[PDB]
């Protein structure tokens, strides 16, 4: 265990120490870099001069040039200049050109694009782990498919099956599904991608796929990663009929998601988590079993496992005698986690109409009723019990 | 006068903003009309005195930089004036006097003062 | 030992401060050189940089017409839509650029040092393509009912056309391999793959249609032209409802650009030439959004239906998928299939790897008959419902 850090170790001393001795040491003595190793600098450093284009590396070729679409409205096919490798320049990253002859002089840049910025999405929770009571079992699960082989995929991909991946989440919706996934997430220490299903299917023309591959691609090279996919529900509820692209655009991603999960593409370590409000609404294509492993579905909220929601709210809420949790619970149904937090949310807004800023027993009773109607609302349920 | 007519004969000029400035004493410009260059700082505006989104002058088939321009430019910027903000007061609108407090409390209000 | 704990430390800000140095010798970053390839390659690298040769501006060639002023000339159109007549720069031949062959012209000086290859203007299509892949053979169920028939159509062809010139039968063409998601389309065509040993390329369509109208056209086109002239390859076209829908108009939208690329693909498997005996697949995802042209014996002389496995595949994909597994052996791997309700392929798999996972969990060297028997009661009942299968099949 100790003894191979020190293995590790060995490799890079010498790495930066040899870099350093080499360059300053052999340019003084003999002939070895000496005038070989001047030249590469200064010939890259005046060819590059004042302006660069920038361009992007489309492709490689096995020829000493390349296929480089410049930012200037030209296409090139370029020659490489004596002193810059070919096999450096990454299909990922973009590379500068020098802008009077096109020849890659280098890389300097990488560049950025708003593309990526979608996929990237940085969570810091409000609520969190341990700020969510009750429905115990249901997180159990959720984690023996998610956190156990993305933690150790070693014994998972070794016995022969592929490592079991992601999670449905369906049921009466309000259970706090989306925060299952987001504290989930902080325990595991997976990067938190969040990304619509419906952003997806947008006005542009066969930019719908693309965005898809892009959102695999970028969870992959993260390297621990959850995909938090949230209303991805949306695609198949509705046939929009308000992009240009159509019914198309709607098949074509569709199809691009299947591909990309596993396909023959069979990517690793990206674990799918998947928000919907039942699976029954859900597309067909999209939803098959062995994708996901597991499914699960919540019971109705009871009235137990709403206390211990509440505890946790009434901590981070003002402090009084006059906060009344059992009351509100007691009057409601077996019914949401939602709520708990709605009736909480709905009291603090109430409070700044009195031009108060205590949040008390009033306030709670009056978000009572409208939290109540708006989510399902009892009094047409009482005839049919 | 004299002078003027050297200084004023030049190859041309180019009006770009920086993009992006790095830390490798190039600064990321793109030049409005055509596309993004990469280019070494000049000795009047480099990396230490210029913040990203300012736009930049430029004197031509070098790109080297002159003055800054003071002012910002965003594609945000000339949205918010083309869309154009209503004159219209609430007094104005009123009878819908009702309607002016309930509206007020969710949109208003937390963004106003997020920390109440 | 402790002398050395302190350069883990140490040897990150080491790295960093040299940075400037080791980006000139190594490479990326300032004055990006490699010093392996690009300094064997510098004398031949002289030669370029002298010449007008960079640029080399993307382009293909519309006709070679020569013409006076300076002899020789062709009339090239730019991949950006412009065309240009440009000059013959000394180092090749007019004899090497041919009209409609893909060629390279200056933007400094217009003329041709070296022809630029053609056709691989697609970068999209590429992107997906991984070549020989395959989960592991053990899941796939090993050799099916469903395998073998495949093999006889694909491998044979490719592995050696002298048996069928011998026999004098015409050589087949095209499978067409269909049913719901997850009955293994895909999965199956990967595993004849390996064993025919063809180079591979797999592709979704849905990269093959791009931007407007026409240009996912020329991507289908090329590539297709591409993959005949190589000899012995094998295409497994993967999911296509994406160039593979239905044909209509209603003149209140339109299928017509996802018809263009459908049609582009059916016309180029046979042709309106005899047949190769390079082979396509071709993987649908409805049976109810074919035309008649696709069906037609030469471009799909056997139709064989993948959906969801058959009677002796169910219990196949269990055993040969238990047996890689450590996994209890006194419970029969057959019954677990069989409870399993009109499975698709994917559907059988899930048992197993539900029933795996509960054996990893506890981390034993089997597994034990309480994991499959949670694994298969939750299977029947919800999973099933749940498939792609119910809804698909009454439409198909």
């Known amino acids: ?385 | 006068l004299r002078e003027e007519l050297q200084l004023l004969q030049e190859q041309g000029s180019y009006v770009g903003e920086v993009v992006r400035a790095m830390d490798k004493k190039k600064v990321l410009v793109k030049v409005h009309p055509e596309g993004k260059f990469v280019v070494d700082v000049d000795k009047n505006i480099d990396i230490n005195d210029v913040t990203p989104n300012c736009r930049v002058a430029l004197r031509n088939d070098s790109y080297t930089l002159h003055k800054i321009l003071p002012n910002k430019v965003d594609p945000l910027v000339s949205l918010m004036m083309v869309e154009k903000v209503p004159d219209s007061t609430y007094e104005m609108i009123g009878g819908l006097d009702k309607q002016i407090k309930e509206i007020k409390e969710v949109i208003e209000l937390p963004v106003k003062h997020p920390e109440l | 030992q402790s002398t050395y704990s302190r350069q883990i430390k140490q040897v990150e800000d080491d790295i960093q401060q040299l940075l400037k140095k080791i980006n000139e010798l190594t490479g990326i970053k300032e004055s990006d050189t490699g010093l392996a390839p690009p300094a064997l390659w510098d004398l031949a690298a002289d030669k370029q940089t002298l010449q007008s040769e960079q640029p080399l501006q993307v382009a293909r060639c519309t006709k070679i017409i020569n013409a006076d002023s300076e002899d020789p000339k062709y009339i090239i159109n730019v991949k950006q839509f412009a065309k240009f007549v440009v000059d013959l720069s000394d180092q090749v031949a007019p004899t090497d650029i041919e009209e409609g062959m893909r060629v390279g012209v200056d933007r400094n000086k217009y003329q041709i040092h070296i022809p630029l290859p053609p056709k691989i203007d697609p970068t999209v299509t590429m992107m997906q393509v991984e070549e020989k892949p395959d989960v592991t053979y053990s899941d796939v169920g090993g050799c099916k009912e469903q395998i073998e028939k495949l093999r006889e159509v694909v491998e044979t062809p490719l592995l050696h056309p002298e048996r069928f010139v011998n026999l004098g039968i015409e050589p087949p063409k095209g499978v067409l391999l269909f049913g719901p998601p997850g009955t293994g389309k895909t999965l199956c065509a990967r595993a004849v793959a390996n064993r025919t040993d063809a180079c591979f390329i797999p592709v979704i369509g849905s990269e093959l249609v791009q931007k407007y109208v026409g240009e996912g056209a020329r991507m289908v086109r090329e590539l297709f032209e591409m993959a005949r002239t190589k000899k012995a390859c094998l295409i497994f076209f993967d999911e296509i409802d994406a160039i593979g829908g239905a044909r209509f108009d209603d003149g209140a939208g339109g299928d017509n650009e996802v018809q263009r690329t459908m049609l582009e693909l059916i016309n180029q498997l046979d042709g309106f030439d005899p047949r190769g005996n390079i082979k396509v697949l071709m993987a649908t995802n409805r049976p109810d959004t074919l035309d008649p042209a696709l069906m037609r014996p030469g471009r799909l002389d056997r139709k064989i239906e993948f959906s969801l496995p058959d009677l002796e595949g169910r219990t196949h994909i269990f055993k040969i998928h238990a047996r890689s597994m450590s996994v209890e052996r006194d419970i029969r791997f057959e019954l677990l299939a069989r409870l399993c309700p009109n499975s698709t392929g994917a559907e059988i798999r899930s048992v197993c790897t539900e029933a795996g996972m509960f054996a990893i969990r506890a981390r034993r060297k089997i597994a034990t008959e309480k994991d499959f028997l949670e694994a298969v009661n939750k299977v029947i009942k919800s999973y099933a419902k749940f498939s792609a299968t119910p809804r698909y099949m009454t439409y198909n």
């Open chain 1, 1 to 385: 265990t100790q003894c191979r850090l020190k293995l590790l170790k060995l490799e890079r001393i010498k790495d930066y120490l040899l870099m350093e001795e080499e360059f300053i040491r052999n340019q003084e003595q003999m002939k070895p870099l000496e005038e070989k190793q001047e030249e590469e600098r200064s010939k890259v450093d005046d060819l590059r001069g004042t302006p660069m284009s920038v361009g992007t590396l489309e492709e490689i070729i096995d020829d000493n040039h390349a296929i480089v679409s410049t930012s200037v409205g030209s296409e090139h096919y370029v020659s490489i200049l004596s002193f810059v490798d070919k096999d450096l320049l990454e299909p990922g990253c973009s590379v500068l050109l020098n802008h009077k002859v096109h020849a890659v002089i280098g890389v300097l840049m990488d560049d950025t694009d708003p593309l990526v910025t979608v996929m990237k999405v940085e969570k810091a929770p409000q609520e969190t782990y341990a700020d969510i009571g009750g429905l115990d079992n249901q997180i159990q699960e959720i984690k023996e498919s998610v956190e156990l082989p993305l933690t150790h995929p070693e014994y998972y991909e070794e016995m022969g099956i592929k490592p079991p991946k992601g999670v449905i989440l369906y049921g009466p919706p309000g259970t706090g599904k989306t925060l299952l996934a987001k504290a989930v997430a902080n325990q595991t220490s997976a990067t938190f991608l969040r990304v619509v299903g419906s952003e997806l299917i947008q006005k542009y023309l066969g930019d719908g796929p693309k965005l898809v591959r892009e959102l695999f691609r970028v969870a992959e090279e993260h390297a621990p990663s959850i995909v938090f996919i949230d209303e991805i529900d949306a695609i198949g509820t509705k046939r929009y009929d308000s992009n240009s692209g159509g019914e198309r655009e709607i098949q074509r991603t569709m199809l691009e998601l299947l591909n990309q999960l596993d396909g023959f593409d069979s990517r690793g370590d990206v674990k799918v988590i998947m928000a919907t409000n039942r699976i029954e609404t859900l597309d067909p294509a999209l939803i098959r079993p062995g994708r996901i492993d597991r499914k699960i579905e919540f019971p109705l909220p009871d009235e137990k496992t709403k206390k211990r929601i509440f505890q946790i709210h009434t901590s981070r809420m003002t402090l009084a005698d006059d906060v009344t949790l059992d009351d509100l619970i007691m009057a409601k149904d077996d019914l949401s986690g939602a709520d708990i937090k709605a009736i909480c949310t709905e009291a603090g807004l109430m409070a700044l109409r009195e031009r108060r800023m205590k949040v008390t027993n009033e306030d709670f009773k009056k978000s009572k009723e409208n939290v109540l109607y708006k989510k399902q609302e009892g009094t047409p349920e009482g005839l049919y019990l």
